[PDB]
Amino acid sequence: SMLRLQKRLASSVLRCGKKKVWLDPNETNEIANANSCQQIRKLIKDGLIIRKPVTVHSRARCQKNTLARRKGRHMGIGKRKGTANARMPEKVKWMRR
Amino acid sequence: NEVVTREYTINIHKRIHGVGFKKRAPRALKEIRKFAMKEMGTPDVRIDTRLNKAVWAKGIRNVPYRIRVRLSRKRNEDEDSPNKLYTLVTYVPVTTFKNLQTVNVDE
Amino acid sequence: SSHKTFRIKRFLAKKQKQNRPIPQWIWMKTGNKIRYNSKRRHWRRTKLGL
RNA sequence: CCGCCGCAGGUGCAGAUCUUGGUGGUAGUAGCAAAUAUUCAAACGAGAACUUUGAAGGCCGAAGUGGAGAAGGGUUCCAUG
RNA sequence: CAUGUUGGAACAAUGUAGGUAAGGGAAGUCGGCAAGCCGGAUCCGUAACUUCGGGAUAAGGAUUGGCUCUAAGGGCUGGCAG
RNA sequence: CUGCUUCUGGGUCGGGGUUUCGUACGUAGCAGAGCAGCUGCUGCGAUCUAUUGAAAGUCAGCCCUCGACACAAGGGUUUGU
């Protein structure tokens, strides 16, 4: 009926956002009469209110792209926006030398 | 007699034609509800969540042109609406809609 | 603010306890003329002075 | 409460872009068009486009629609109805 | 977070906010207003004038993807090895 | 402006025709700048060639179906010289 209290509490116990708290939609009535955190810690252990995993942001194609950059691909004249100095400055070279 | 299950393919592409990019997927849900009402004559249509995901699979603007739908007239369960029977509109995954007729499946 | 003075916090404390409705046994009295509490003070509408 | 005889006056309204209050026609009209977006089932319930939950699709995109404060507010906090 | 105090159905005129237009090309107009062109980087090249600092990214050109190599630029242990 | 049974009519889906774009995915190859790894076989490789005028969309206001599939003699409000 209303579960706004027990998505806020659960989030504050799981140490995630309420973006990630999974209140069991079929076991609605068992969550709604928790009304406190000690009662929610039971409903974590009993597998009703569950921490959803992180939405996957894979940088697999990033790694795959950067391995082309190490070879010197995607690094032609049409992929240089900033100046020769801005990209790899002369003072930093003269320091190296 | 009344508790019937029948397969259909719905050309959504010609039920969705001309309607704005932010109202193609929402529109498409209404001409699967209008379609369900037309064939299996129940003003009560209840459409499956898997069929929703299939319409919203390509986002809001891009919608699958043809969709395959098992349409099932069932008896309406207790706390009866004035509608005595309802339609459950379930998704059927299909690789190609080529040479697919409207199949009268049996229970 | 959060940072208050004891004189201001006392001022606010009084204006809370004045901001309650009438008791419903007051209108059953003999020389009764009070319908509601006319001096009820909402925090969006009237801003308490200061 | 009033007739007659005197007495007295803050004594007669259509107007003053009069004053105060009330109500019209316009009119069920103008309008409810800034910042991309909702959708499906379910729950509670007399009642659901809007609540809640779940699933989906999106947005803010770390100079944020995020997490905290100072001024100011002053109970707006929290629960339950 | 739930589209910024509402939804649904249409897709008329007139708007408001974006576009695109054959051929011409400012003939429009008070006036190129608005729009459009140009635009990043690399390699050439750069006039008058100048208070010699500038002008200057003047102007004007060429190039730019993807792939696959080649060479060059270094640490570290005992003109060379690891 | 039309349609709603001549045992037939519209609808829907399928197939044709039309037409738009330009040759799909997979797979194969002594095709491919090469490079790596094994003593000519084996990886990586944009791309190319064949399959393949292929694949995809095509009335929603395109054309013809006679092929599946239901559905279609119903409801509502009125009207007399």
DSSP letters, A53-71, are PPPP---HHHHHHHHHHHH
- One-letter amino acid identity for B104? N
What letter would DSSP give residue A19? Answer: T
Q: How far apart are CA C46 and CA C40, in angstroms?
A: 10
Positions on chain E within 7 A of a protein C-beta:
1, 9, 11, 40-43, 63-71, 73-74
Token pair belonging to B8: 């259909």
Residue C47 half-sphere exposure, CB side, CA atoms within 13 Å?
Answer: 1
Q: Give the experimental resolution in Å.
A: 3.1
Q: Is B55 exposed, middle or buried (0-12, 13-18, 19+ CB in 10 A)?
A: buried
- One-letter amino acid identity for A83? T
Residue whose token pair is 């996957």: A56
Experimental method: cryo-EM
Q: Which residues are CB-contacts of A32 (< 8 A; sequence separation ≥ 6)?
A: A1, A2, A3, A6
Q: Does residue C45 reach within 7 angstroms of strand D, measured from its CB?
A: no
How distant, in Å, are the alpha carbons of A33, A74, B48 from that of C40? Answer: 36, 71, 53
Q: How far apart are CA A28 and CA A3, in angstroms?
A: 8
Cβ contact B58:B64 at 8 Å? yes
Cβ contact B9:B80 at 8 Å? no
What letter would DSSP give residue B71? Answer: E
Q: Does residue A50 reach within 7 angstroms of strand D, measured from its CB?
A: no
- One-letter amino acid identity for B63? V
CA of B38 to C1' of F57 (A): 26
Chains near C, with 3+ CB pairs < 8 A? none
Q: Which residues are CB-contacts of A18 (< 8 A; sequence separation ≥ 6)?
A: A7, A8, A10, A11
Chains near A, with 3+ CB pairs < 8 A? none
- One-letter amino acid identity for C19? N
The alpha carbon dihedral of B20, B25, B26, B30 has a sign of positive
Q: How far apart are CA B8 and CA C41, in angstroms?
A: 64
- A68 marked ligand binding residue: no
Select from A33, A25, A24, A26 the least CA-distant residue to A5.
Answer: A33
Hey, which bits of chain A come out as E strands?
Answer: 21-22, 50-51
Cβ contact B90:B81 at 8 Å? no
With CA of B18 and C1' of each nucleotide, the nearest comes out as F60
